[PDB]
Write a protein that holds these residues in place. Structure first.
Motif, PDB file in Angstrom:
ATOM      1  N   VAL A  11       4.524   7.012 -20.785  1.00  0.00           N
ATOM      2  CA  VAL A  11       4.795   6.572 -21.982  1.00  0.00           C
ATOM      3  C   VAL A  11       5.625   7.988 -22.713  1.00  0.00           C
ATOM      4  CG1 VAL A  11       3.547   6.764 -24.425  1.00  0.00           C
ATOM      5  CG2 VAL A  11       2.517   5.410 -22.444  1.00  0.00           C
ATOM      6  N   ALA A  38       6.511   5.206 -29.708  1.00  0.00           N
ATOM      7  CA  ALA A  38       5.813   5.661 -28.411  1.00  0.00           C
ATOM      8  C   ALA A  38       6.466   4.240 -27.464  1.00  0.00           C
ATOM      9  CB  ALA A  38       4.368   5.542 -28.697  1.00  0.00           C
ATOM     10  N   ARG A  95       0.551  -2.530 -33.720  1.00  0.00           N
ATOM     11  CA  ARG A  95       1.483  -3.893 -33.201  1.00  0.00           C
ATOM     12  C   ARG A  95       2.562  -3.347 -32.342  1.00  0.00           C
ATOM     13  NH1 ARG A  95       6.094  -3.951 -37.003  1.00  0.00           N
ATOM     14  NH2 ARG A  95       7.126  -5.648 -36.122  1.00  0.00           N
ATOM     15  N   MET A  97       1.901   7.153 -32.768  1.00  0.00           N
ATOM     16  CA  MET A  97       0.613   7.518 -33.378  1.00  0.00           C
ATOM     17  C   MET A  97       0.682   9.072 -33.056  1.00  0.00           C
ATOM     18  SD  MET A  97      -0.379   5.012 -34.964  1.00  0.00           S
ATOM     19  CE  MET A  97      -2.053   5.086 -35.252  1.00  0.00           C
ATOM     20  N   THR A 104      -5.840   0.160 -30.388  1.00  0.00           N
ATOM     21  CA  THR A 104      -4.560  -0.073 -29.293  1.00  0.00           C
ATOM     22  C   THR A 104      -5.318  -0.539 -28.157  1.00  0.00           C
ATOM     23  OG1 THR A 104      -2.586   0.866 -28.514  1.00  0.00           O
ATOM     24  CG2 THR A 104      -4.452   2.281 -28.305  1.00  0.00           C
TER      25      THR A 104
HETATM   26  C1  LIG Z   1       0.675   1.799 -32.688  1.00  0.00           C
HETATM   27  C2  LIG Z   1       1.224   1.371 -31.416  1.00  0.00           C
HETATM   28  C3  LIG Z   1       0.702   2.300 -30.522  1.00  0.00           C
HETATM   29  O1  LIG Z   1       0.034   1.919 -29.760  1.00  0.00           O
HETATM   30  N1  LIG Z   1       1.491   3.461 -30.309  1.00  0.00           N
HETATM   31  C4  LIG Z   1       1.066   4.331 -29.323  1.00  0.00           C
HETATM   32  C5  LIG Z   1       0.627   4.158 -27.986  1.00  0.00           C
HETATM   33  C6  LIG Z   1       0.350   5.019 -27.253  1.00  0.00           C
HETATM   34  N2  LIG Z   1      -0.011   4.758 -25.875  1.00  0.00           N
HETATM   35  C7  LIG Z   1      -0.051   3.183 -25.508  1.00  0.00           C
HETATM   36  C8  LIG Z   1      -0.417   5.917 -24.972  1.00  0.00           C
HETATM   37  N3  LIG Z   1       0.434   6.259 -27.754  1.00  0.00           N
HETATM   38  N4  LIG Z   1       0.188   7.782 -26.988  1.00  0.00           N
HETATM   39  C9  LIG Z   1       0.338   8.511 -27.803  1.00  0.00           C
HETATM   40  C10 LIG Z   1       0.211   9.993 -27.678  1.00  0.00           C
HETATM   41  C11 LIG Z   1       0.738   7.896 -29.053  1.00  0.00           C
HETATM   42  C12 LIG Z   1       0.629   6.621 -28.892  1.00  0.00           C
HETATM   43  N5  LIG Z   1       1.090   5.701 -29.558  1.00  0.00           N
END
Ligand SMILES: */C=C\C(=O)Nc1cc(N(C)C)n2nc(C)cc2n1
Length: 301
Positions: free
Chosen positions: A27, A44, A77, A94, A155
């Motif tokens: 990621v 992300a 989403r 996020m 998520t």
């Molecule tokens: C709101 C969409 C989302 O899931 N964003 C997202 C996803 C992930 N994953 C899948 C690990 N994220 N990791 C971090 C640190 C932020 C983040 N945001």
């Protein structure tokens, strides 16, 4: 039969975004500039590593399917996908990471108001998924992300299914309803069980449930009538809500809509429902960032 899913799957050009850094290992933290829009959206980016496993590609596109079909303030989403050598999922950044990591990192600065508001927000997310006849099947504090300390989103739709009978994989035993462990039954009510365990993780500031108990034991312990213990900070009012989420009769557990109601009532008077040392004192929050817009203010017809 069922209502058609008219959600839009947005295909993005690789040139539309820059990867800024790595978050997990894959990621990335990046910026997305929609083609000729003059906005910058912190994102992300989940990019398949191997890319030679057809099995793997069927798992990330199932996740893309689900994330494209959900629109609720407490559910993460999908902004779009990129179809390079490697499939990339593009989502809202996020910034504060998972709620699990956040309660661990900040146990000393988290008041009753935040904990109960999180329980409400996660109950709304789960209620919305239930409205959309969607069973998550992996609700846990690790799978709730922090946009701001005031604002969380469910998520990881990796295991999400519709309205469920399954046949194997590496599974989250310690978060699973009894009917799920025994008979691979999953319902909104199995999700309520996992809500119960998720709340326990927050109220113990990220303790591992049934810590140092082997997963093979878990099914037997729960039939024997044992449950996770009352966390220190928890009034019997809050703990009784957790315990009802862990009733053997799935229909005897609360509905997400009821969990919203109960926790909102408690969030109206937080110090009456959670007892935390020093609660009253608790405090929490590229080159040109001018055209930055959070995904939540970036709307598409
Ligand atoms: C709101 C969409 C989302 O899931 N964003 C997202 C996803 C992930 N994953 C899948 C690990 N994220 N990791 C971090 C640190 C932020 C983040 N945001």
């Amino acid at each position: 039969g069922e209502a058609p899913n008219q959600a839009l799957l947005r295909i993005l050009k690789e040139t539309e975004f820059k990867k800024i850094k790595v978050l997990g290992s894959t990621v990335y933290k990046g910026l997305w500039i929609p083609e000729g829009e003059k906005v910058k959206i912190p994102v992300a980016i989940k990019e398949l590593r191997e890319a030679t496993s057809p099995k793997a590609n069927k798992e990330i596109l199932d996740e893309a399917y689900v994330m494209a079909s959900v629109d609720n303030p407490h559910v993460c989403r999908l902004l779009g996908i990129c179809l390079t050598s490697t499939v990339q999922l593009i989502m809202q950044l996020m910034p504060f990471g998972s709620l699990l990591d956040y309660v661990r990192e900040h146990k000393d600065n988290i008041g009753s108001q935040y904990l109960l508001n999180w329980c409400v927000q996660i109950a709304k997310g789960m209620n919305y998924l239930e409205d959309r006849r969607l069973v998550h099947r992996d609700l846990a504090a690790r799978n709730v992300l922090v946009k701001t300390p005031q604002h969380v989103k469910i998520t990881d739709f990796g295991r999400a299914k519709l309205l469920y009978h399954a046949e194997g994989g590496k599974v989250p035993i310690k978060w699973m309803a009894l009917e799920s462990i025994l008979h691979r039954i999953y319902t909104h009510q199995s999700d309520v069980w996992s809500y119960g365990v998720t709340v326990w993780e927050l109220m113990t500031f990220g303790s591992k449930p049934y810590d140092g108990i082997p997963a093979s034991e878990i099914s037997s312990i729960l039939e024997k009538g044992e449950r996770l213990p009352q966390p220190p900070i928890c009034t019997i009012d809050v703990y009784m809500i957790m315990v009802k989420c862990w009733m053997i009769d799935a229909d005897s557990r609360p509905k997400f809509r009821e969990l919203i109601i109960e926790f909102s009532k408690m969030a109206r008077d937080p110090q009456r429902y959670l007892v935390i040392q020093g609660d009253e004192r608790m405090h929490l929050p590229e080159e040109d960032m001018d055209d930055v817009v959070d995904a939540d203010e970036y709307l598409i017809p």
